[PDB]
Every structure is written in structure tokens, then in C-alpha cells.
């Protein structure tokens, strides 16, 4: 229904300087994506907390609210209410700036996830490449948290956070190059409007590549070494007490949600009940919008579910067993996939 048009025209009817009107529509989706991001964090926390109890014949929170619905609310409000402590020789500027640096770009990368056509913020012609770029800023914040702490116990485990995050960006890049072949570019709308009746069937290998490189962004118990609670307590996090630890926590879960939404838009699509949709008009547009949003969230939820379900199925790996995936299983296979897709697009340019 082009809500931008009516918002600007109704607001341009009582004046308000039409350029200013186009300026004043900016913050609405820019904060709506923050709303759904925070909600996705709350949902991811509650989901992990209840499914990690289902796996174990356990029952998660039910005394917080009805079903633990208000558990991360309690967590966040507490961590606001907690004291913050700045240890003895730690720096004052870098300590309270590390978590901001590792948290910000994950939010900033929500300017590309569609949720529906013309239902996103500012489709960039670069798109996913900007995500691959902004994701490489996190190790700076992690090394900042390591250096800005007298805790050798922390820095010894903050360098290995800039060893895996600096290792699973190359195949993460190659698996999306393999999609940039097909889709005439890099914009998400172009990656997905190429699906009108999915890339997973034609990228059976790059799926594993992207999906192993996304889980291994210092997130999950298959690796999550920099928070290896048993190996060395909380790594770089153990001196962060109040809302700063909440920033780290938030950042992990919101990055997981972003990975799920991004696998959805890349390989499956944030539309397309798998029949060739649009074969069957504002009252119909508001229906297909809801349908596309719903199916997007279905696939994102399935990937969040599988991701949390590996956390309780897959014991961790030291650091050498880890880095012998990168450069020895993900990078050669990503190169092979790239060359394969290139050769097939050269021979069979149809279907790509």
C-alpha cells in the first residue's frame, strides 16, 4: 500500500516542507528493526532456555511469568541495576568501549534483511558484502577487551577470539560469492527475487560452508572457545559485570538471529510459500506481506532451532581441531564450489 507515500502525503497535506517530510519517515523503520531485533534476542534467549531443557527432560523457567516469557526482561533489568567495576590497572576508555565495538555492527547490518519486498530499510547495491565487511570489526573490540584488562587470563583467551573470527570470513565470503554469480549482483532483493518458483538445491555444498562459518562466529558450543567456561572461565568476559556483560550477551544472540535471517534470504527466501507465488489490490497486498513475513520467520526460526540444538549435541574443539576446518575443509571446499558454479554458469547459463 506504499505506506511511505501515504505517510508523506498526509503529512504533506498540512505542510511541513515535503523534503522535511521525506526526512521524517526515516526513524520509523530504523527503530522498527530495533524492535524486532530486541524481540528476536528475547525470543532466542527464551527458546534456548526452554529447548535446552526439553533435550534433558527438564523444565525451564515457569515461575518468572507463565512460561519464562519475562526471563530475559529480568536478566536485562538486573544487569542495568548491577554495579559496574573498573579493575585496578585496566584502561577507562577501552574497557567501556570494547563491547560497544563488538555489538554495534551486528545491529548496523540489519539494513539489508528484507522481511518482505519494499519492507526493509534502504536496499543497498552492496548488501551482503557490507555485512562481510562489518563483521570483521568485532575482533578489534575483542582485542580491546583483552588489552584493557590486567587479567592475563582474559587476554590469553581474547587472542583466540581473533583467531577464529579471523578464520571463518574467507569461506563465509566464498559461499556468498557463489550466490553473487546467480543473482546479477549482491543486493538481498536481487539474491531472492531470483527465486520465483531455491539456491540450496543448486548450492548443496555452499550451504554447509556458510552455515558452519556462521555458527562459528564465537557463538555456539561446537566452538565458542572465547567463552569456554570450562577451559578458562568466560575468557574475555570475566571482568565485565553489569550492563557491559549484557552488551556481549545481546551481541551474541542478535548476531545469531541475523545469521538465521540471512541464511533465509540467501538460500531459501523471505517469501515464496514454495509454490510459484503471485499466480493467484491493497487487501491482497496486505495478505501476501503477512504471508511472506510469516514464512521468513518460519525459516529463521528453524535455523535458530538447529543452531541452538547443535549447542547441546556437539562437544567443543581445542583450537587446532578448530583451525583445521578453516584452510583445510571450508576454504578448499569453498573454492571448489566457486569454481564449480562458475563453470556451470559458463556451460549452463540457464537456471543461474
Amino acid at each position: 500500500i506504499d505506506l511511505q507515500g501515504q505517510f508523506i502525503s498526509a503529512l504533506q497535506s498540512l505542510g511541513l516542507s515535503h523534503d522535511l517530510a521525506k526526512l521524517l519517515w526515516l526513524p520509523l523503520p530504523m527503530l522498527m528493526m530495533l524492535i524486532v531485533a530486541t524481540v528476536g534476542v528475547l525470543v532466542a534467549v527464551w527458546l534456548e532456555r526452554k529447548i535446552s531443557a526439553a533435550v534433558q527432560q527438564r523444565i525451564g523457567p515457569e515461575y518468572i511469568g507463565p512460561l519464562g516469557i519475562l526471563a530475559p526482561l529480568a536478566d536485562g533489568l538486573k544487569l542495568i541495576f548491577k554495579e559496574d567495576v573498573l579493575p585496578a590497572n585496566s584502561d577507562r576508555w577501552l574497557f567501556t568501549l570494547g563491547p560497544a565495538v563488538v555489538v554495534i555492527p551486528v545491529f548496523l547490518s540489519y539494513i539489508i534483511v528484507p522481511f518482505g519486498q519494499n519492507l526493509l530499510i534502504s536496499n543497498l547495491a552492496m548488501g551482503v558484502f557490507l555485512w562481510i565487511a562489518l563483521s570483521s570489526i568485532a575482533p578489534i573490540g575483542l582485542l580491546m577487551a583483552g588489552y584493557a584488562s590486567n587479567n592475563k587470563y582474559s587476554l590469553l583467551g581474547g587472542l583466540r577470539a581473533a583467531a577464529q573470527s579471523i578464520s571463518y570470513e574467507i569461506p563465509l565470503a566464498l559461499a556468498v560469492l557463489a550466490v553473487a554469480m546467480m543473482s546479477n549482483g549482491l543486493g538481498t532483493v536481487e539474491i531472492v527475487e531470483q527465486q520465483s518458483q531455491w539456491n540450496v538445491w543448486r548450492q548443496p555444498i555452499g550451504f554447509l560452508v556458510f552455515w558452519i562459518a556462521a555458527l562459528a562466529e564465537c557463538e555456539r558450543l561446537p566452538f565458542d572457545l572465547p567463552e569456554a567456561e570450562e577451559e578458562l572461565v568466560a575468557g574475555y568476559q570475566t571482568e565485565y559485570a553489569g550492563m557491559k556483560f549484557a552488551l556481549f550477551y545481546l551481541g551474541a544472540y542478535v548476531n545469531l538471529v541475523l545469521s538465521a535471517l540471512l541464511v533465509s534470504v540467501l538460500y531459501f527466501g523471505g517469501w515464496s510459500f514454495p509454490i510459484p507465488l503471485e499466480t493467484i489490490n491493497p487487501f491482497l497486498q496486505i495478505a501476501f506481506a503477512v504471508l511472506g513475513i510469516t514464512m521468513t520467520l518460519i525459516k529463521a526460526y528453524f535455523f535458530v532451532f538447529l543452531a541452538i540444538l547443535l549447542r547441546w549435541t556437539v562437544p567443543r574443539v581445542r583450537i587446532d581441531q578448530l583451525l583445521d576446518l578453516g584452510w583445510k575443509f571450508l576454504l578448499p571446499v569453498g573454492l571448489v564450489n566457486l569454481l564449480l558454479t562458475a563453470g556451470l554458469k559458463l556451460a549452463f547459463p540457464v537456471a543461474f
Binding site: 533435550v55 534433558q56 592475563k152 549435541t313 562437544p315 574443539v317 581445542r318 581441531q321
Partner: protein
């Protein structure tokens, strides 16, 4: 704020506050670039003074202390503290109370191996088996709470002349149900682990001792038996109700964490093979049939004789243990517990001593870390079934 790197080996502290279960233990470890040269293990954080408390406390007064050495299994040591003065006085023990002793003590062995298994896997990644053992090890808690009062530890079920209290009515067939429910699940663990590559690649060949190098250092338990040594005090010492059952003492030879794991996991099946074979042979069977057959005719019959009673003459708190020293021992999960008892003439002993297996087994922590890594330490430390409570003497 920073730390001023230098070309020297780094010293780090794995302090009392472990994020784990393996007691409270220091390991001042020095490394050469994510290696390990050696480490000074500063144990001592749990010395509360047993061996001098045991000199103003008679037997029945001291027996609840005894179950705090091995916090996991508080009957491999109640049994020893029973057997120590029991041999000097030469008090005959019946077959019923001794079969009960065998059953409960071997059930505690099962519990001990489960509590080894849990944190062994938590320190080596996932936490789910920690939740699958307290889903299963919690049933023998209910068994004990039925027979004795409290659960793992503090039962104080054993006594000098035998056993304190005859069993409950519905204990035996329910223990059979547990015995039958267990074997399908030690296999489900081996479905979830023992071939998962991310697990077995973590502890392929870390740690190793030769046969005769594991005998200087005296690694009395499965560590000594996980290096090619058929030796268990249940068989070589002819512990009380043995040679009456079938036997298959497990042995591995690699000496590494697999050689310990396979031994423990086969032992926790051989134990059930003993238990199922004991319940079918009691002097009296279940207490239901026993008491019924007694009251039916046996106010004098042979179903009220000494060998069918759960204890001989019940003693006073003035038993007055006789003179003469000796060393008793028992093969528990961690290995050989031992007590060097002396006695002079009175209720209070003279130099109560504990010889725990964990102490000698934990001597060789650093040799096993003779240049391995920083992150494969817990895999080795989790191999011994270290219980720092058993290092308070």
C-alpha cells in the same frame, strides 16, 4: 593495563575456584608457548584434620566422618572403617549382611563411575551427559534412601558385626528393575559418545604410563589396570563374598585416556553382572519372604540362624577395640583405599590413617602434562576421578 610479553615460559594459576567438580585444586602451571613443562599442584585446600579427629572418636562416633573422604561413594570407606577393628576382635560376619554389603558397595561403584563420567564430558565440551547421569544416578539415591536414611554419603548403614539394618520390603525386585533399566542406557551413552569425532579426537593419546612406571608411582586404581595389569583386590585378596561370582576384570594397554575410559565403562557393566548374580543368592532372599518364612514356623528354625541375621551381637559404644596393628584395604572406584590401624587397648584408636588412591594417582599429574597443551589438562585431570575430599589425609 597490559602485560609486557617476553621470551620466557608463562606461569598461570588454575586456582581453587575451578568452574568444575574436580575438587578445589591449584595447578601452578608453567608453559612454553601453549605447552606444559611442569606444574606445582598446591593441594591442601581441604585439610580439616581427620587423622587427629579419629583419636577422640570411637568407631560408631566416627563412622559418619568416614563417608566424606570419597564424597561420591560413602560406602567404600564406611566398609573399611568397619573391617579394620572387625578383624582384630575376630567377629564373624554372616553371608547375608556381607551380600548386602557387596550389593550396596558395588552400587556405589556404579555411582562413582557415573560421577566420573559427567564432568569428564563437561570439561570436554557438552553438558548433556551431566544431566543424563543425574537422571539415572538419582535412582540409586532413592534405593539408598529406602534402605538407609540419607542418599549418596552419610548413610552410615554399616556396622562392625555386619550391617545396621535389614533391608526394606520392596527393595530387591526394584533393584532388579534398575539393573534391567541400566544396560539399555550405558549403550545409549555409547550412541551419543565413544565414536563422536569431536570427542575421541580430543583424548586420542594424551597421557601415558608404562606398566612398571605405573608401579613405582603406585597408581593403585584403574590407572594401574589401564596399563596392562590384571590386578583387583576383589579377586587377589579374596574379599569377603567373592570367588562365588563370575568375573571379567577389564584391562587396557594403551595407558591413555581411552585405556581408562574403556576400563571404567566395562567395569560399570561387570558391576551390574555381579549385582544381578548376588540378588539371586541371598541367605533369605528378599526380606519379605525371609520375615514371612521366619514368623510362619521359624521361631527356632534355620531361617533365624546366625548366617541369616543381618548382624551378630549388636555392640555398645564401649566396644574397646583390642591391641595389635594391621592394614586393611578395599578396591573402590578410584582404586585402593587403605587404613593402617593400631589401637592400644581402648575405644579411642592410636594413629588412624587413611591411604587414599586419589593421593597417589594424582601424584602423576605433571608427568602426564610433560608437554601436551593448556586445554587438554582437564581431560587428563578428569581421567583419575580425582576427589579432593579423598586428599584430606
Amino acid at each position: 593495563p597490559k602485560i609486557e610479553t617476553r621470551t620466557e615460559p608463562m606461569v598461570i594459576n588454575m586456582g581453587p575456584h575451578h568452574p568444575s567438580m574436580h575438587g578445589v585444586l591449584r595447578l601452578m602451571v608453567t608453559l612454553d608457548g601453549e605447552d606444559v613443562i611442569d606444574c606445582e599442584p598446591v593441594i591442601g585446600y581441604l585439610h580439616r584434620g581427620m587423622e587427629k579427629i579419629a583419636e577422640n572418636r570411637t568407631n560408631i562416633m566416627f563412622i559418619p566422618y568416614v563417608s566424606r573422604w570419597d564424597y561420591a561413594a560413602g560406602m567404600f570407606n564406611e566398609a573399611v572403617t568397619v573391617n579394620a577393628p572387625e578383624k582384630l576382635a575376630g567377629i564373624p560376619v554372616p553371608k547375608r549382611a556381607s551380600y548386602i554389603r557387596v550389593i550396596m558397595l558395588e552400587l556405589n561403584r556404579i555411582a562413582n563411575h557415573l560421577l566420573w563420567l559427567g564432568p569428564f564430558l563437561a570439561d570436554v565440551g557438552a553438558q548433556t551427559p551431566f544431566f543424563y547421569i543425574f537422571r539415572e544416578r538419582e535412582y540409586i539415591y532413592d534405593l539408598f534412601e529406602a534402605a538407609t536414611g540419607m542418599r549418596f554419603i552419610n548413610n552410615n548403614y554399616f556396622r562392625i558385626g555386619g550391617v545396621a539394618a535389614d533391608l526394606t520390603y520392596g527393595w530387591v525386585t526394584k533393584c532388579r528393575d534398575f539393573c534391567d533399566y541400566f544396560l539399555p542406557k550405558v549403550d545409549e551413552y555409547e550412541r551419543l559418545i565413544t565414536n563422536n569425532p569431536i570427542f575421541v579426537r580430543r583424548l586420542q593419546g594424551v597421557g601415558k604410563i608404562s606398566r612398571e612406571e605405573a608401579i613405582n608411582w603406585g597408581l593403585s586404581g584403574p590407572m594401574l589396570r589401564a596399563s596392562g595389569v590384571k590386578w583387583d583386590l576383589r579377586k587377589v585378596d579374596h574379599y569377603e563374598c567373592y570367588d562365588d561370582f563370575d568375573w571379567d576384570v577389564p584391562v587396557a594397554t594403551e595407558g591413555d585416556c581411552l585405556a581408562r575410559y574403556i576400563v571404567r565403562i566395562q567395569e560399570m557393566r561387570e558391576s551390574v553382572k555381579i549385582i544381578r548374580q548376588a540378588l539371586d543368592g541371598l541367605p533369605g532372599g528378599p526380606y519379605e519372604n525371609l520375615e514371612a518364612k521366619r514368623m510362619l514356623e521359624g521361631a527356632k528354625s534355620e531361617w533365624n540362624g546366625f548366617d541369616y541375621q543381618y548382624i551378630g551381637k549388636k555392640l555398645s559404644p564401649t566396644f574397646k577395640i583390642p591391641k595389635g596393628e594391621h592394614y586393611v584395604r578395599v578396591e573402590s572406584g578410584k582404586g585402593e583405599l587403605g587404613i593402617y590401624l593400631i589401637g592400644d587397648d581402648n575405644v579411642f584408636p592410636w594413629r588412624w590413617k587413611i591411604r587414599p588412591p586419589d593421593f597417589n594417582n594424582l601424584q602423576v599429574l605433571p608427568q602426564l602434562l610433560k608437554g601436551m597443551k593448556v586445554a587438554d589438562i582437564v581431560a587428563i585431570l578428569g581421567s583419575i576421578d580425582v576427589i579432593m575430599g579423598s586428599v584430606d589425609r
